Amino acid sequence: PMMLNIQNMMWWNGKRNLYRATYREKTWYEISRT
RNA sequence: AUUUUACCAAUUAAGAAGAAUAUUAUAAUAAUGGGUGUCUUAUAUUUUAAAUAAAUAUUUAAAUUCCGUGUAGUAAAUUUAUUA
Numbered sequence: 001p002m003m004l005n006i007q008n009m010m011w012w013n014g015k016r017n018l019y020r021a022t023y024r025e026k027t028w029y030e031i032s033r034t
Numbered sequence: 035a036u037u038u039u040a041c042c043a044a045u046u047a048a049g050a051a052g053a054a055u056a057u058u059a060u061a062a063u064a065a066u067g068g069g070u071g072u073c074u075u076a077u078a079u080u081u082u083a084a085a086u087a088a089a090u091a092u093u094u095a096a097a098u099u100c101c102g103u104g105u106a107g108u109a110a111a112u113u114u115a116u117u118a
């Protein structure tokens with residue numbers, strides 16, 4: 001698969017990536033706030 | 035004695051519940067997939083993985099670089115919160 005630049009989003013097309021966390025405690029933007 | 039030639043002109047008041055828990059945004063308190071005329075059991079009713087996503091970010095510098103596609107907490111549970 002390699003999911004090369006595929007816009008897989010639930011609200012966009014109803015499909016989510018196979019390898020990802022179903023829950024995230026802090027969004028990536030919150031982690032960047034060093 | 036019967037006896038009126040041919041052609042030439044115009045859309046205007048609308049009578050009636052035959053108009054509404056009506057359309058579209060707006061509610062930051064709920065949420066296990068809604069299916070009524072339904073209704074026995076489930077060896078037959080199981081979807082999960084550290085990445086940009088139904089979670090969406092207050093600047094104009096420098097700087098990698100052969101059109102620089104770029105800005106960092108404002109508060110540490112603090113009052114921008116996905117509401118019916």
Ligand SMILES: [Mg+2]
Nearest residue numbers: 040041042043
């Ligand atoms: Mg005339």
Ligand SMILES: [Mg+2]
Nearest residue numbers: 048050052053
């Ligand atoms: Mg009428």
Ligand SMILES: [Mg+2]
Nearest residue numbers: 063064065117
């Ligand atoms: Mg709630």
